[PDB]
């Protein structure tokens, strides 16, 4: 079903050049905000986390339990809907809510064939933020036990960046387990636990209150 806590104790054992001395907890339905300098090792950590909780070698895999959202918005050949679903069964109410929360409702409607507008090597090209919104919608649509969101906001104005964090990350995914690599202090205020990395090591693990008490 689910272990209410996962204790990671990587004291420079895995990915030694980038990651060194990271120790933290992840509990069900909590928003963990990974933050830190540029060379901290945020993406490396999400990748590390993933390679621990993943099925091993050649296993049937069936339903996958981790849902990853990379920085590099990916677009496979196929319709806007196919890209979001990504193999997973369609559900109109699950899909339409994910679209509205990821703020793609207006964008999809103006396009010619709407959800069936084909993307990739044979079809339409997309906006920088529009690719990032599809990449995020695809990740939040997948029902997974854990969500790794490496800088899901990019090429988005602070008006939509703070609206998608509020509607999608905090209102829609309120009960899912999130690990969100973020920068803005507003994201850190709404977080359940804050992990601050520095040059590959964990320097702070706690709440926004403890963080401001320490500084």
């Amino acid at each position: 079903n689910g272990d209410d806590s996962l204790f990671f104790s990587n004291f420079s054992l895995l990915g030694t050049p980038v990651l060194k001395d990271i120790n933290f907890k992840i509990e069900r339905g909590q928003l963990l905000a990974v933050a830190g300098s540029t060379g901290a090792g945020k993406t490396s950590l999400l990748m590390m986390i993933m390679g621990e909780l993943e099925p091993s070698e050649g296993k049937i895999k069936h339903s996958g339990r981790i849902s990853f959202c990379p920085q590099f918005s990916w677009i496979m050949p196929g319709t806007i809907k196919e890209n979001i679903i990504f193999g997973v069964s369609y559900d109109e109410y699950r899909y339409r809510s994910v679209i509205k929360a990821c703020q793609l409702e207006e964008d999809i409607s103006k396009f010619p064939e709407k959800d069936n507008t084909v993307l990739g090597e044979g079809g339409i090209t997309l906006s920088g933020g529009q690719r990032a919104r599809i990449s995020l919608a695809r990740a939040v649509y997948k029902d997974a036990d854990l969500y790794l969101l490496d800088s899901p906001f990019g090429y988005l104005d602070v008006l939509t960046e703070k609206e998608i964090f509020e509607s999608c990350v905090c209102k829609l995914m309120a009960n899912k387990t999130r690990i969100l690599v973020t920068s803005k202090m507003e994201h850190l205020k709404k977080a359940d636990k804050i992990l601050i990395l520095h040059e590959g090591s964990s320097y702070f693990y706690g709440t926004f209150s403890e963080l401001q008490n320490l500084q």
Partner: nanobody
Amino acid sequence: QVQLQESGGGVVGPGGSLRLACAFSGRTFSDYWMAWFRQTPGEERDFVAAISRSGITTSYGDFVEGRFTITRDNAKNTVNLQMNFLKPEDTADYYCAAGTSSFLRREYDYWGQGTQVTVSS
């Protein structure tokens, strides 16, 4: 084709300490995650501890509250469970399981024979 064999069981006093140890054999230990369970006769099966393929990720039963620690030696092929502050109610047969599934939704594919631990007041 794997086979497991626990050891370290015995009878310590109330508020004691004991170190259980299983033996993975027959395949690459590194590919499997481990787990510890217990069976207090008459009561339900209880999840005790679980450890990832590398050993960087662990998770414990709600009843441990900090007392037990799960470790592994991928070179010597063993998973160890260090139990401290054992209260009499922790008396049970401790089984060790190994799987090669997702760590979030675990499927305990293989099991051990169980070693008896007893906390005699």
